[PDB]
Symmetry: C3
Subunit: 332 residues, 3 copies
C-alpha cells in the first residue's frame, strides 16, 4: 500500500535484500519483510553461525532464481528464498563443520531453486503449492550420500539402525518447552525464546496465522502424547514443527477460515504429527531426518483433496494471502 | 433398473447403509449391495471382531465423504467406502488390541477419504482410478510410526530385518488353500471358506469378474512357484491377493475383454506377484507390510500405458461397469 | 535424407533390426543405426553373453511395443528399445546365471515397454521425456524380490547392510580408467576400450554429444573426488555414468546449447554424481543398485524446471534431435 513514487528510490541491492527477507518470511508462509527480519533475529539470537548460513542459503537460492530468470513477481514474493533459508540451516545442524560447508550451503540453496521451479511447473496444473518439498528433496540428495562421500561427517543425530520398540515423565515443562521449540524447530532452532520471537514475527503479518502457529505446535505435542511418544522428543518440539506448518497453511491461507475448514485444518495437524513418527521410522535404517516431509505429504493430500469437497472452500493459490486478507476479499 | 417410485421409500440411514455395502463391494470393484453384504458375511464368518472393524472403517470413510460434501454419485457408488473397509481390517490384523483401536480405525477410515479425493483429483487428469492407494498410504502413515509412538504394539508379523536368502513341499493342499486364501487375503482373511464366499459374492454381480478373481489367485500362486518362493507364503495366498485385484481390474472392467486385453491382463497378474516379493523386501528393514502396493503400482502402470497401445482397448473410467455391461454397451 | 525409393526395398525384418539398432543408440539419446551398431560392438567386445542379452532385451521390448501397437514413429525412433537394452544387460550383470535368465530378460524387456508407454502418457503433459525410468523401475521390480523368490541368486555386488562411514590413492590411472569406464558403465561395461568405442559411436551421430559424454564422465569423477569418495568406485567409473547421461541430455539435446544452458548442464552433471552416493545409500539396507535413478531424478528436476527459467532455452521434446541439428533449426 506504499506510495508509488517510492519505486524511484529502488536499486538492485535493496530489492535483493527485500526479496531475501520476504524469502525468510515465507518459511512460514508470511510474505512480509519485517517477519523475515524478525525470523533472522530469532535465529541469530540462538546461533550466529546458523543465522549467517540461513542468510547465505536464502541469498544463494534467490540469486540463482534471478540468474536463471524466474518471473520477477515469484522472486519478489520470496517464493524462491524460503527453501534456501532451510537448506542453509539444515546442513550445519546435522553435519559437523568443514571449510567446504559454506560452498555446500550455496549449492544446496541453488538446488532448491531448481526444484521449486520443477514443482511449480508440475503441481501448478492443479493449483497446488510446492511447500518445503524443494528444501527437503535437495537436502536429502546432498545429505544421504555422506556415508559414501566423506567430505562432511554426520553429527551424532545421524545414526543408522533398524527400528525397534525409556518413556520419561510429562510435566508442565513438556508443555511450555514443547510449545515454543515446536515453533523454533520449523527452522532447526532448539531455543524457546527463538520460538517466541517466531510467533511475534508471524503476529506482525497476521494474528490468525500466529494463533495457528501456536495451535499446530500444541496439537502436534498432545497427539504425540496421546500416541505414547517418549516425553523427550515431545519436550524438544520434534512433534510440533510439522504440525505448525500444517496449521499455518491450512488455517486460512489455502482455505478460507471457517468452522469447517478449521476442523479440516485440525485433521491435517493431527496426521502431520502421526506422519512424523512414520517418516522418522522409514528413514531410520539410513539414519536420516525426515525434515518437513511429514507436513509436505499430509498437507499436499489435504490440498489436492480440497476441490473435491464442496463443504471445504479452497483459496485459489495465485490469490492466497494472509488469513485476514483472504476473508476480506471473499466478503467483497 | 428399479421402479423410480422406490425413491419415495428412501431415508438417509438406508441410503447410508446401501452406500456402505456398495463400498464393501468396491474392495473388489463390484458396485453391488448384495456383493458387499456377502463380503461382510465372509469376514464375519472368519472373525466377528474383523467384521465389526470392516463395517466401522467403511462407515467412517463414507460419513467423512458425506461430511466434506463429496459429489453424491461418487459416494452412492461406494468409491468412498472400499478403502475404509480395508483400513478398518488392516489395523487389528497387524497390531494387538488396545481400547484406542476403534478410534484409530475411524481415523484411518476418515483419512482414506482425504486421499481418495486427492488421487481422484490427481489421477483424474488421465482417467486413471485411485485403486486401493488411499487405503495403503493412510495405513502406512498410521502404522510405520509404531516404533516411536507406542500406543499400539505390533503383532509378530511385524519384524524389522535386513533381507537375506526353508523351501517346504508343494502338495495339492498348496493349490486348494493357495487359491481360496488368495481371494480371502484381499481383505486380510486367512480363511478358505471366506475365500469361497468372496468368489460367490463377486459371481452375484459378475461371472467374468468371478473367473478373473480365480485366475489371478492361480497366476499369482504359480508365478511365485516358478520364481521359487518357499511354499508356506504360497499356500497362505500371500502371492495371490495382489494378482486377484490385478485380474479383476484388468479383466474386462478397465479394458474391454478380448484375447489381446486378456493377455495384457495376464502380464499384469504375473508382474503383480513378482512386485509382491519386491515390495515385501523394500519394507523389510522396517518390518512393514506392502499391502496392495504391488497391485496398485503394476495396475497403474498398465492403466497409464493403455491409451498408447492401439491394440489394447481401454474402457473410459467414468463409464466402466462390470465386464458383461462393458461388452454390452460396446456392441451398441 | 535418403532416396524415398529405398522404401521399396523395406521388409518387416530389416525395419525391425533398424528399430533395434536405433533402440540401442537411444541408450545415450542417439537416434542413429550405426551408433547402436557400434554400441553393440563395444558390448560384444567386452562380453558375448552381455551382448546377446542386450540384443535380446532390445528385441523383446521393441516387439512388445509393436505387438501392443505403439505409434510407428515412436518405435522407428528406438524409443521402445533403449530401456530394453539396459533391462537385458542389468540382469546377468547383477544376478548369477540360471537357464531361466533369457526368459527373465525377455520379461524385463517387455515390462520396460509398458512403463515407457505409462511415462510418455504421464510426463507428456509437460513435454518431459521418460529417460531410463522404464528400465530402472522394471529392473527394480524384477530384482528386489530375489531374497524371497529364489529362482535367481544375487551376485556378490548385492549385499544388504546398514550404511556406515579405506580411501585408496588417486593416480593418473584413476583418471584414464575413470573417464572411459564412466562411459562404459552407462551400459554396465567394466571395460576401458568399450568406453572408447562408445564415445566413437556417439561421435558418428554427434560431436557435441560425444564431448558431453566425455565432460560428464569427468565432472562425475572429480565431483566424487572433491566429495571424498574412496578412489576404487571413482576409478571404476561408478560416479561417471549418471553424469554421462546428464551431460548428453542437458548438453544441447533438450536444451539449445549456449553458455547459459552449458552452465545449467554442469549443475545437473555435478548433482547427478552427488545423487549417486545418495541413492546408493538409500538402497543399501536391501543391497540393491540405484542404476540410473540418480541421472533420472536430477535430469527430470532440471527438465521440469526449464520452462520457468527465461534464461534457459528448452528444446520442445517432440522436435529434439542432435545438438547440431537443434542449433541448425533454431537459426532458421
Ligand atoms: Au532483507
Ligand atoms: Au537489508
Ligand atoms: Au531489505
Ligand atoms: Au529486511
Ligand atoms: Au503465500
Ligand atoms: Au555460516
Ligand atoms: Au555454516
Ligand atoms: Au495431551
Ligand atoms: Au491436549
Ligand atoms: Au448395507
Ligand atoms: Au443395511
Ligand atoms: Au442397505
Ligand atoms: Au447391504
Ligand atoms: Au467401478
Ligand atoms: Au471392532
Ligand atoms: Au477392532
Ligand atoms: Au506352477
Ligand atoms: Au501353473
Ligand atoms: Au540392427
Ligand atoms: Au540388422
Ligand atoms: Au538393420
Ligand atoms: Au544396425
Ligand atoms: Au531423442
Ligand atoms: Au544371453
Ligand atoms: Au544372459
Ligand atoms: Au578433481
Ligand atoms: Au577436476
Amino acid at each position: 500500500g506504499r506510495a508509488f513514487g517510492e519505486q524511484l528510490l529502488k536499486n538492485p541491492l535493496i530489492e535483493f535484500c527485500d526479496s531475501v527477507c520476504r524469502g525468510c518470511g515465507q518459511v512460514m508462509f508470511q510474505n512480509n519483510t519485517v517477519t523475515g527480519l524478525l525470523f533472522f533475529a530469532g535465529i541469530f539470537y540462538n546461533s550466529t553461525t546458523l543465522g549467517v548460513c540461513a542468510v547465505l542459503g536464502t541469498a544463494a537460492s534467490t540469486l540463482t532464481a534471478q540468474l536463471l530468470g524466474v518471473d520477477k513477481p515469484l522472486v519478489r514474493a520470496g517464493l524462491f528464498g524460503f527453501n534456501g533459508t532451510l537448506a542453509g540451516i539444515a546442513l550445519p545442524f546435522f553435519f559437523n563443520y568443514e571449510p567446504a560447508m559454506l560452498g555446500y550451503v550455496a549449492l544446496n540453496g541453488a538446488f532448491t531453486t531448481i526444484i521449486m521451479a520443477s514443482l511449480l511447473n508440475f503441481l501448478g496444473k492443479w493449483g497446488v503449492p510446492a511447500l518445503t518439498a524443494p528444501f527437503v528433496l535437495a537436502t536429502w540428495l546432498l545429505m544421504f550420500g555422506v556415508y559414501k562421500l566423506s567430505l562432511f561427517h554426520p553429527g551424532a543425530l545421524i545414526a543408522p539402525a533398524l527400528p525397534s520398540v525409556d518413556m520419561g515423565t510429562v510435566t508442565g515443562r513438556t508443555f511450555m518447552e514443547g510449545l515454543f521449540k515446536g515453533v523454533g524447530e520449523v527452522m532447526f532452532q532448539d531455543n524457546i525464546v527463538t520460538g517466541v520471537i517466531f510467533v511475534v514475527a508471524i503476529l506482525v503479518n497476521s494474528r490468525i496465522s500466529a494463533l495457528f502457529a501456536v495451535i499446530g505446535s500444541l496439537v502436534g505435542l498432545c497427539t504425540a502424547l496421546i500416541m505414547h511418544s517418549p516425553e523427550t522428543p515431545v519436550r524438544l518440539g520434534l512433534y510440533g514443527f510439522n504440525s505448525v506448518l500444517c496449521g499455518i497453511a491450512m488455517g486460512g491461507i489455502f482455505f478460507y477460515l471457517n468452522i469447517r475448514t478449521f476442523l479440516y485444518a485440525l485433521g491435517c495437524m493431527v496426521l502431520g504429527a502421526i506422519a512424523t513418527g512414520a517418516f522418522s521410522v522409514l528413514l531410520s535404517p539410513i539414519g536420516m531426518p525426515a525434515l518437513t516431509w511429514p507436513f509436505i505429504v499430509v498437507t499436499w493430500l489435504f490440498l489436492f483433496a480440497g476441490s473435491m469437497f464442496r463443504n471445504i472452500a479452497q483459496v485459489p493459490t495465485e490469490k492466497a494471502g494472509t488469513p485476514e486478507d483472504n476473508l476480506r476479499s471473499l466478503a467483497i
